[PDB]
Design an enzyme around this catalytic site. Structure first.
Site, PDB file in Angstrom:
ATOM      1  CG  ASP A 106      57.773 -23.427   5.926  1.00 56.30           C
ATOM      2  OD1 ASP A 106      56.857 -23.903   5.224  1.00 56.30           O
ATOM      3  OD2 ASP A 106      58.737 -24.104   6.348  1.00 56.30           O
ATOM      4  CE1 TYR A 214      57.779 -30.822   6.724  1.00 58.78           C
ATOM      5  CE2 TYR A 214      60.057 -30.713   5.992  1.00 58.78           C
ATOM      6  CZ  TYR A 214      58.778 -30.200   6.000  1.00 58.78           C
ATOM      7  OH  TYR A 214      58.492 -29.063   5.279  1.00 58.78           O
ATOM      8  CG  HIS A 273      54.136 -21.449   2.043  1.00 61.58           C
ATOM      9  ND1 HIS A 273      53.410 -21.664   3.195  1.00 61.58           N
ATOM     10  CD2 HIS A 273      55.392 -21.882   2.303  1.00 61.58           C
ATOM     11  CE1 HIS A 273      54.196 -22.194   4.115  1.00 61.58           C
ATOM     12  NE2 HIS A 273      55.404 -22.337   3.599  1.00 61.58           N
TER      13      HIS A 273
END
Ligand SMILES: CCCCCCCCCCCCCCCCCC
Ligand SMILES: [Mg+2]
Lengths: 292, 294
Positions: A106, A214, A273
Site C-alpha cells: 500500500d 492523500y 489487499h
C-alpha cells in the site's frame, strides 16, 4: 488474536524531527515491516511472533498513523511519502542497524520502492505486496478505476475528516468498507478486531493524519514520485500479489519489468489487499525462505 | 422560522401512467411552468422563487421519483432509477393535469431530464431553461483529470457503505450534505442552519438517501449509459441558459459544448452564483424566466 498490549512497545526520537512508535521482538537479521492505509503496526500482528524466530522484527507506525507523531496537521508538506521514507532510514540509524530486510505494501509499497533506490546500501533484500510503481497514476485515476480511487479524492475535503471522526460508529462504518471491499473474502476482520482498529483511528489526529497522506501524495497537484524512482533496480525483491485486490489489481504485474530486473512473483488467488491479515501463513513462509 | 415553510404550500400526490406516485406543490395563475430539482434537493429548493413566479405562471414543482415525498421504486432495482424514467414521469404528470404544453426549467439531474424532454416531448414544451446544463458530452470531462477531484461523490454512492454512513444519524447526514450545498455554491454558506435542518428532515425520510444514490448507480456508474442516440439531436427550441460561474462540479467553462446540441439559445454567466441558482440568486431566476417566457 494477539492484542496490541500483548506486544513490546517502544517510542524513540528520530533525526527526521519526528517521534516514531514501534514494536519489536525476535533475534536475527533485522526485518522491517511497514503498514499502509487503513492500518498501523498492528496489522502485522498475526506474523510477528513466527518471523521473530528468525528475525529481529521491527514494526513501526508511520508518521501520521498509530501512536507515531502527527506533524502539524495543517502542514501537508510533512506528510509526503519521501518524509516517511527518510523516517525508515533514520529509524535504522537510531537503532544501530547497518542494513535490514524491508517489507511494505500500500503506501509502504511506495516507501519501499523509494527506499531501495535512495538507501540501497541499507537494504539486504526486500519484499513488496501488491506493488505500486511510478506509472500507477494513469491507471489509478483512469477509466474505469475511478470507481475504486474515489476515496483518495474524498479525503481532500474537510468534510471527510469531520464525518468519519464524528463518532466511533461513523468511523467503524467507513473503515469497514475498505477492509472488506479490498479483500478476497467478504469479511476480513472479526468485530473485535475491527473494534481495535476503531480504537486506533479514534486516537487524536489519526483520521486527519491519514487523510493528509492523500492530500500530500494523491491530490491532482501532488507529485510524490521522483526521477530516482524510475531507476531499474537489481535488488532481489519478493513480490506477492492478492488477486482479490480491487484497488491495486494484480493485472498491473506486467509493469514490474519496467522497474525490477531480479524479482519473484506469486499471484495468490484467494488473497486481497492485506496479505498479512488474510494469508499470514504465506507471508511467513516466503519471507523466511527469501531472506535466507 | 425565517423562510416560507414547506408546510405553507399546496401539496398533492398523484399516481401516474408510469407506475409511480409523484408528489408536487402548485400555485399561481398563468401559462404552466414546471420546475425540476436535482441532487441534493427536492421540490422545496425552488421555494424562494415559487410565489414570485406564481404571479405570472401556473407553477408546478414535483419531487423526482426517488426524492422528497415521491415514491421510491424498489430500492434494490436501480433500473427504476434511470433519467429516462424521470423524463417520462414529467410527461405523465402533464397528462394527468390536463396540460398540453408547458414552460420547463431544470438543472443538475434535471438538466439532463430537460435535455431529453425537449427532444422526445417537444410537442409538450413552449420554451425551456437549463441552469448549468449537462450535455451527452459530459462524461469525458466529469470523469477526466482533474475533475475527478470533484466527481468522487458519484462513485462513493455506488457503495453500500455510503448509504450506511450518511443515514447513520441526523449529524452524519447533515455533515455530508452541508459540504455539497456550500462547496458547489459561489458563497461560503448557502443555507441557514434552519434551512439545512429541513434538508436533513427530508433526507432522513425512508429511502431518500438510498434513493438519491440510486440515481448515481443507474446513470453514473462505469457501466452506465444514460444518454440515447436521440439526445444527440440538435434542437432549435428556444432555451434559456444561466450558468453560475462559481459552480465547481458543473463549471461554466463547459459552455463551449452547447452549440454541439442547441441552435437557438441564450447564455448568461452569473458571476456571483454557483450550482443552485434558485437558492443563491433567486431574483435572477425570477427576472430571467419571467422575461424569457413572455
Ligand atoms: C494524473 C495524476 C494526477 C496527480 C497524480 C498524483 C499521484 C499519482 C500517483
Ligand atoms: Mg471483499
Amino acid at each position: 488474536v494477539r492484542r496490541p498490549e500483548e506486544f513490546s512497545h517502544n517510542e524513540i526520537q528520530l533525526s527526521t524531527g519526528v517521534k516514531i512508535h514501534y514494536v519489536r521482538e525476535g533475534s536475527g537479521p533485522p526485518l522491517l515491516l511497514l503498514h499502509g492505509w487503513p492500518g498501523f503496526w498492528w496489522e502485522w500482528s498475526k506474523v510477528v511472533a513466527p518471523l521473530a524466530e528468525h528475525f529481529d522484527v521491527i514494526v513501526p507506525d508511520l508518521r501520521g498513523f498509530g501512536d507515531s507523531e502527527k506533524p502539524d496537521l495543517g502542514d501537508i508538506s510533512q506528510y509526503t511519502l519521501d518524509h516517511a521514507t527518510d523516517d525508515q532510514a533514520a529509524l535504522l540509524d537510531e537503532l544501530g542497524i547497518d542494513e535490514a530486510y524491508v517489507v511494505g505494501h500500500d503506501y509502504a509499497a511506495i516507501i519501499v520502492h523509494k527506499f531501495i533506490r535512495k538507501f540501497r546500501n541499507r537494504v539486504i533484500k526486500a519484499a513488496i505486496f501488491d506493488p505500486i510503481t511510478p506509472d500507477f497514476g494513469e491507471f489509478y485515476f483512469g477509466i474505469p478505476h475511478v470507481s475504486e480511487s474515489w476515496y483518495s479524492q474524498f479525503h481532500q475535503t474537510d468534510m471527510s475528516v469531520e464525518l468519519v471522526s464524528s463518532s466511533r460508529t461513523a468511523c467503524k462504518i467507513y473503515f469497514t468498507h475498505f477492509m472488506n471491499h479490498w479483500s478476497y473474502r467478504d469479511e476480513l476482520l472479526t468485530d473485535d478486531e475491527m473494534e481495535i482498529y476503531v480504537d486506533n483511528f479514534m486516537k487524536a489526529g489519526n483520521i486527519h493524519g491519514g487523510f493528509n497522506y492523500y492530500r500530500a501524495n494523491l491530490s491532482m497537484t501532488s507529485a510524490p514520485w521522483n526521477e530516482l524512482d524510475d531507476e531499474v533496480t537489481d535488488l532481489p525483491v519478493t513480490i506477492l500479489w492478492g488477486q482479490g485486490d480491487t484497488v491495486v489489481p494484480s493485472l498491473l504485474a506486467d509493469r514490474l519489468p519496467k522497474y525490477y530486473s531480479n524479482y519473484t512473483l506469486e499471484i495468490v488467488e484467494d488473497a486481497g489487499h492485506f496479505m498479512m491479515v488474510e494469508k499470514p501463513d504465506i507471508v511467513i513462509e516466503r519471507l523466511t525462505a527469501a531472506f535466507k
